[PDB]
Amino acid sequence: HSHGLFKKLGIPGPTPLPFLGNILSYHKGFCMFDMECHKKYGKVWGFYDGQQPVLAITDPDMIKTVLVKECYSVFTNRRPFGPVGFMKSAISIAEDEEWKRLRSLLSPTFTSGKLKEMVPIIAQYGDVLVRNLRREAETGKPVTLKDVFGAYSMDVITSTSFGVNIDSLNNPQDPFVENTKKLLRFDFLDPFFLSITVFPFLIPILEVLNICVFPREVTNFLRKSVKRMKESRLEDTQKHRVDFLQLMIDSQNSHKALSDLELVAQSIIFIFAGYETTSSVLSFIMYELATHPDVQQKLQEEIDAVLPNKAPPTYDTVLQMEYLDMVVNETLRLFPIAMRLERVCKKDVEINGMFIPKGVVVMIPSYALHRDPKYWTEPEKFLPERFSKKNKDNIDPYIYTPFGSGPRNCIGMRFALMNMKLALIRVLQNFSFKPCKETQIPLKLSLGGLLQPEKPVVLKVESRD
Numbered sequence: 001h002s003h004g005l006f007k008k009l010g011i012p013g014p015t016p017l018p019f020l021g022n023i024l025s026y027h028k029g030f031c032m033f034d035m036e037c038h039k040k041y042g043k044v045w046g047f048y049d050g051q052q053p054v055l056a057i058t059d060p061d062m063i064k065t066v067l068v069k070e071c072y073s074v075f076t077n078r079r080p081f082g083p084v085g086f087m088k089s090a091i092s093i094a095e096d097e098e099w100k101r102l103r104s105l106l107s108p109t110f111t112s113g114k115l116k117e118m119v120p121i122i123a124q125y126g127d128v129l130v131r132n133l134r135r136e137a138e139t140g141k142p143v144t145l146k147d148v149f150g151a152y153s154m155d156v157i158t159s160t161s162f163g164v165n166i167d168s169l170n171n172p173q174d175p176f177v178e179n180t181k182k183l184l185r186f187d188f189l190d191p192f193f194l195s196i197t198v199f200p201f202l203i204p205i206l207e208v209l210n211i212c213v214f215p216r217e218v219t220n221f222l223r224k225s226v227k228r229m230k231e232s233r234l235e236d237t238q239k240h241r242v243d244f245l246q247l248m249i250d251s252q253n254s255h256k257a258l259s260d261l262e263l264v265a266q267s268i269i270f271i272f273a274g275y276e277t278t279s280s281v282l283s284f285i286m287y288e289l290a291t292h293p294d295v296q297q298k299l300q301e302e303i304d305a306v307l308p309n310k311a312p313p314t315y316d317t318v319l320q321m322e323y324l325d326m327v328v329n330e331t332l333r334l335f336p337i338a339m340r341l342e343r344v345c346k347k348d349v350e351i352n353g354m355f356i357p358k359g360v361v362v363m364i365p366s367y368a369l370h371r372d373p374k375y376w377t378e379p380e381k382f383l384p385e386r387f388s389k390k391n392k393d394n395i396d397p398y399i400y401t402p403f404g405s406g407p408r409n410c411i412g413m414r415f416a417l418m419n420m421k422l423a424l425i426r427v428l429q430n431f432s433f434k435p436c437k438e439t440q441i442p443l444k445l446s447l448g449g450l451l452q453p454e455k456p457v458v459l460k461v462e463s464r465d
């Protein structure tokens with residue numbers, strides 16, 4: 001019962017109930033709870049996830065000392081979350097020294113160089129998306145974005161980690177599409193995870209019963225999948241391509257190296273971390289564009305000016321589109337799908353005047369901060385202008401953090417950005433998007449612990465001649 005803590009330190013917050021902490025307050029989701037506390041406790045506050053104390057911070061400098069300055073020594077890990085199994089060694093779950101080794105070994109995977117080399121691969125599935133989406137534009141019945149984009153997203157993950165070239169959308173069956181599909185990001189407000197937070201003592205029990213938040217079904221398949229390919233597939237050499245797996249294998253053959261269990265776990269996590277995030281953001285971007293016909297027109301003019309007569313998109317060409325970048329960034333402001341960044345304080349400290357005791361989870365409420373009236377004129381509005389070179393000097397890099405910051409930010413950032421824009425450039429060269437009847441306006445965020453549409457986005461899709 002650390003419920004005494006925040007008053008003992010003099011830190012404001014809502015009143016915990018015995019056992020539950022402040023969880024009952026999650027009935028309206030992480031984001032709405034965060035915005036409420038901000039409005040009423042000011043710069044910093046505390047609360048309890050069961051008996052787990054969590055201190056929220058909104059100070060640009062404070063946030064930076066945590067994410068940047070003192071990542072290495074004090075604020076290195078995220079909070080443990082459930083029985084994790086062999087995935088305990090995935091880079092985004094790993095901790096302290098184990099984590100640093102992996103971050104180092106996997107860094108070259110996401111180089112500028114290696115990114116450029118993957119353009120021809122992912123571009124090839126831009127084509128396929130178009131081909132596909134076209135079919136629906138003829139059908140004239142409203143499109144489901146999460147489905148069209150999920151396909152695209154899966155298509156791109158598979159190929160860029162050993163080239164498993166599959167049209168997911170039309171191959172509803174293939175063993176490989178089915179397993180991966182089931183790799184859905186976790187809802188830390190579902191019945192299961194709510195119980196884990198209140199009875200965290202129940203975790204070691206589950207670990208001993210070989211139960212795991214990553215279903216046995218999918219991970220088994222994948223290890224046994226990666227199995228055949230990793231050796232006895234490319235054990236014949238020739239036509240070596242660029243993909244995360246080879247990239248990781250190449251460091252397997254001459255604090256170095258990756259084990260045959262650690263490599264399987266990164267492979268899985270990349271999917272987990274990339275699959276639904278990419279597809280979701282892309283839905284939010286298409287939503288914004290359809291409910292803002294103007295911005296879409298502006299965007300299609302830029303694309304056409306840079307890439308005349310449907311010319312195929314490229315690396316250098318993509319880094320050159322400033323309005324595209326603006327639209328992507330605005331969308332992320334409004335829908336920063338991680339919602340919060342979190343670090344566990346490993347030892348007593350004081351940071352710009354405020355003392356953090358060992359064991360507290362320090363939490364930065366991204367969704368809140370992105371909508372804070374202090375930094376944003378018209379917070380709730382979709383306005384890409386906000387991110388023009390003529391203004392970007394006015395956005396604070398520790399208020400706007402859709403991919404986090406410091407040494408433990410999204411290692412897949414440049415790749416996510418490039419991949420998404422590629423999808424957009426090709427989709428927008430060919431079609432336009434339009435609100436439907438079944439389109440929700442204004443859209444409504446879920447009650448869950450995911451940032452996602454309450455009801456999946458469906459839009460009218462019109463071809464360009």
Ligand code: HEM
Pocket residue numbers: 091092093103269270271273274277278281336337338341342401402403404405407408409410411412413415416
């Ligand atoms: C647009 C979709 C995506 C968004 C919004 C996104 C956002 C983030 C955020 C906010 C974090 C936490 C950073 C922190 O703790 O401060 C993160 C971590 C991470 N992301 Fe991304 N991400 C996206 C796609 C990706 C992709 C495509 C990959 C790689 C394939 C990726 C791999 C990771 C990994 C491995 C971590 C943990 C890094 C570490 O602990 O060293 N995510 N992501």
